[PDB]
Amino acid sequence: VNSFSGYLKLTDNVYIKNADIVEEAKKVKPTVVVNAANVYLKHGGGVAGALNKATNNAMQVESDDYIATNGPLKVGGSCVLSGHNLAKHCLHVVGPNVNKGEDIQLLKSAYENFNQHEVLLAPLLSAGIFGADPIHSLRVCVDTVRTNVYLAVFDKNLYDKLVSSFL
Numbered sequence: 001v002n003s004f005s006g007y008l009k010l011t012d013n014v015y016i017k018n019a020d021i022v023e024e025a026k027k028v029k030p031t032v033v034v035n036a037a038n039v040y041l042k043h044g045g046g047v048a049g050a051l052n053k054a055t056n057n058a059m060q061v062e063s064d065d066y067i068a069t070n071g072p073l074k075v076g077g078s079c080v081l082s083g084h085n086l087a088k089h090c091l092h093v094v095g096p097n098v099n100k101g102e103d104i105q106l107l108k109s110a111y112e113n114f115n116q117h118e119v120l121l122a123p124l125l126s127a128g129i130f131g132a133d134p135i136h137s138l139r140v141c142v143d144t145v146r147t148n149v150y151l152a153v154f155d156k157n158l159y160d161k162l163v164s165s166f167l
C-alpha cells in the first residue's frame with residue numbers, strides 16, 4: 001500500500017490522475033519525483049520551471065553545480081539529485097524535444113530510467129512543451145516501465161483524452 005490517492009489504474013503498474021505535479025509532490029512527498037529535464041538541467045519552463053520554482057530555485061542551484069562537475073546529460077539519460085521540499089529524490093530525465101528535432105525513438109530509452117526506481121511520481125515524458133504526442137508518450141510508458149508509476153497530467157482536457165483513447 002502507498003500514499004497516492006485518486007488515480008485511475010491503467011495497467012498492473014501504471015496509474016494516472018489529472019493533477020498539478022507541483023501540488024501532488026507537496027502532498028505525497030514521494031521517494032522519487034521525475035523532472036522533465038533538458039541536457040543542461042536549465043529548469044526555465046513547463047514541469048522543470050514549475051518544480052524548480054516550488055523549490056525557491058534550490059533545484060537550479062544544485063543542478064548548476066552538477067553540470068559544472070559532470071557536463072550535460074544525454075538525450076534519453078537521467079541523473080538523481082535532491083527532491084528538496086518536494087520528494088526525497090528528483091530523477092531528472094531527458095526525453096527527446098521534438099521542437100529541437102531529437103529522435104522520438106529516444107523516448108523509450110528515457111522511460112527505461114524509471115525501471116531503476118520501485119515507485120515514482122512522474123509527468124508524461126516529451127509531452128507539453130517538449131512537442132511529442134502525449135498519447136504516444138503514454139503508450140511508450142506502459143510498454144517500457146515495469147516499476148510502479150503514478151502519472152500526473154496537468155491539462156484536464158488532455159487527461160480525459162488519454163483515458164478515453166487508452167488501449
Ligand SMILES: O=C(O)c1ccc(O)c(F)c1
Pocket residue numbers: 020021022045046047050123127128129152153154
Ligand atoms: O505537465 C506539465 O506539462 C506541467 C505541469 C505544471 C506546469 O506549471 C507546467 F508548466 C507544465
